[PDB]
Copies of this chain bind each other. A is one copy, B any other.
Amino acid sequence: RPQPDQDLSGIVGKHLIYTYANGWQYELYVKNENTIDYRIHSGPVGGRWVKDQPVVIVRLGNGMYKVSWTEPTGTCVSLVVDLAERWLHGTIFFAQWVSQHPELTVVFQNEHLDEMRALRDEGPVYPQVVIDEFATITFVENCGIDNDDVIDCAPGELPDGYIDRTN
């Protein structure tokens, strides 16, 4: 009864666009074994985007990966990504203050890390608000490792049909 092989070559370099069952459109790029960039297009935190988010990735089975991390806002995330079947499951544990004021996290976070930690330390943190939703993966491409051009602007500054592309 072996635990699955931990080769991550099937996930690193992957760039995906996905729509949660509640309509929220998210974007992910797996920069390397332990780093992602992401960009949020709609829902309460549409406009939020992040580079060089440290992440822990494990392989669950064929084309199936788990991606988990914590954010400077205090938010915790664990994703299950099925590339083969083109779906994803997201658990987002956000702090109470992020639930109350999602607008305050709508930034290029890399230019505002101190502000995020100030809002986090101010709270309130508890109780945490939990989102569990399935998403459809509408788009997948391979952009290779450590490519800083994949996610390099606010979602508002992209062409209008960028988020709507399919394969």
Contacts and interface: CB of A to CB of B under 8 A. Distances in A.
A16 interface: no
The 9 closest A-B pairs by CB, nearest first: A78-B78, A1-B86, A56-B132, A68-B91, A76-B93, A3-B87, A70-B128, A76-B76, A3-B134
Chain A interface extent, by class: 35 or more
Most buried by B among A3, A85, A128: A3
A61 interface: yes
A66 B89 contact: yes
Contacts of A76: 76, 93, 128, 130
Nearest to A93: B76
Given A85-B1, A136-B3, A64 B74 contact: no
A126 interface: yes
Interface string A55-77: 01010110010101110001010
A77 to B, nearest CB: 9
A107 interface: no
A128 B25 CA distance: 27
29 contacts: A1-B85, A1-B86, A1-B87, A1-B136, A2-B85, A2-B87, A3-B85, A3-B87, A3-B134, A3-B136, A56-B130, A58-B134, A60-B80, A60-B82, A61-B61, A61-B82, A66-B89, A66-B91, A68-B78, A68-B130, A68-B132, A69-B130, A70-B128, A74-B126, A74-B128, A76-B76, A93-B93, A117-B126, A121-B126
A127 interface: yes
